[PDB]
Amino acid sequence: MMSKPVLYYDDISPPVRGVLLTVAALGIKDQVELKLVRLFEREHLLEDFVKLNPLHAVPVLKHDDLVLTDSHAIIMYLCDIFGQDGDFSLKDPKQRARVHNRLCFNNAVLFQRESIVMRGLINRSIVTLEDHHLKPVQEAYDCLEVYLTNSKFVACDQLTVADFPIVACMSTVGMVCPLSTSRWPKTAAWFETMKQLPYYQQANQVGVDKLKERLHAVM
């Protein structure tokens, strides 16, 4: 009779996969109900979903009357109510701020730059990738490489929920802007490490593979 959060989702979306990765890492796959909202079917444009989220985007989390409409806020909230006593705890204010700071980096920099390119490719706004498209992504790689020089994972020396949105993005934009282990060695090593998490395949690779298939169709 506990209230279960409901995650409105399409796992081709990197923001969605950041949450899926988080749900698995926190061990709460059984406490979060899923509700599929298929982007290529345009189910995010249905009147109910637009009423739920005027941004008409996934993911969305509904928990009782709480409606979160950004993967990054969903991730922090799931940590608060399910991860306070574990390895992903955000109880310490400086630790919470370190993690939040890198969530902001993903939301405002890395995913923004990935989505300009990916949205243009999907809607056929771009047919050929020019340097104007990939240079901002490589600048984001440069920043990530600095972060992963200063700590072992994106926000500190331990894995945190901030690694999950960034790796969801990294594994997506990587198909059009591949990581060079020589130019970004700390980032490549971190990427390889994250792919080895036991839940990486079901929480992130499935969705990447579906998007790769959609991109092969449009290119």
Ligand X SMILES: O=c1c(-c2ccc(O)cc2)coc2cc(O)c(O)cc12
Q: Smallest distance from the beta carbon of 217 to a copy of itself, in angstroms?
A: 27
DSSP result, 37-98: --TTTTGGGSHHHHHH-TT--S-EEEETTEEE-SHHHHHHHHHHHH-TTSTT---SHHHHHH
Does residue number 136 form part of the binding site for ligand GSH (CB under 6 A)?
A: no
Q: Which of 29, 40, 132, 213 binds ligand X (CB under 6 A)?
A: 40
User: Rule CB under 8 A: is residue 66 a binding residue for a copy of itself?
Assistant: yes
Residue 205 CB burial class (10 angstroms; 0-12, 13-18, ≥19): middle
Site membership for ligand GSH, residue 22 (CB under 6 A): no
28-36, 66-74, 138-146, 149-157 -> range binding ligand GSH (CB under 6 A): 66-74
Specify whether the CB–CB gap between 78 and 5 falls below 8 A.
yes
The β-bridge relationship of strands 66-68 and 33-36 is unpaired
Question: Residue holding tokens 């730059």?
Answer: 113
**Helix axis angle, 163-173 relative to 206-218, nearest 10°?**
30
Between 47 and 157, name the residue whose CB sits nearer to Ca ion: 47
44 is in an annotated binding site: no
Nearer to a copy of itself (CB atom), residue 109 or residue 134: 109
- Which among 191, 51, 57, 31 is positioned nearest to 119, based on CA atoms? 57
Build a one-symbol-per-residue string for 105-144: x at contacts with a copy of itself by CB under 8 A, - elsewhere. Answer: x-xxx-xx-----------------------------xx-
- Bridge-based pairing of strands 60-63 and 66-68 is antiparallel
The identity of residue 34, as a single letter, is L
Judge whether 56 is annotated as a binding position.
yes
122 sits near ligand X (criterion: CB under 6 A): yes
- Residue 9, SS3 per DSSP: strand
| Partner whose binding site includes residue 53, from ligand X, ligand GSH, Ca ion, none (CB under 5 to 8 Å by kind) | none
Tell whether residue 36 is a contact of a copy of itself (CB under 8 A).
no
- Provide the minimum distance between the beta carbon of 218 and ligand X in the complex, in angstroms, as a whole number: 10
Residue 52 makes contact with a copy of itself by CB under 8 A: no
Task: Name the residues that contact ligand GSH, by CB under 6 A.
Answer: 13-15, 39, 44, 56-59, 70-72, 107-108, 115
Residues making up the annotated binding site for glutathione are 13, 56, 58, 71-72, 119
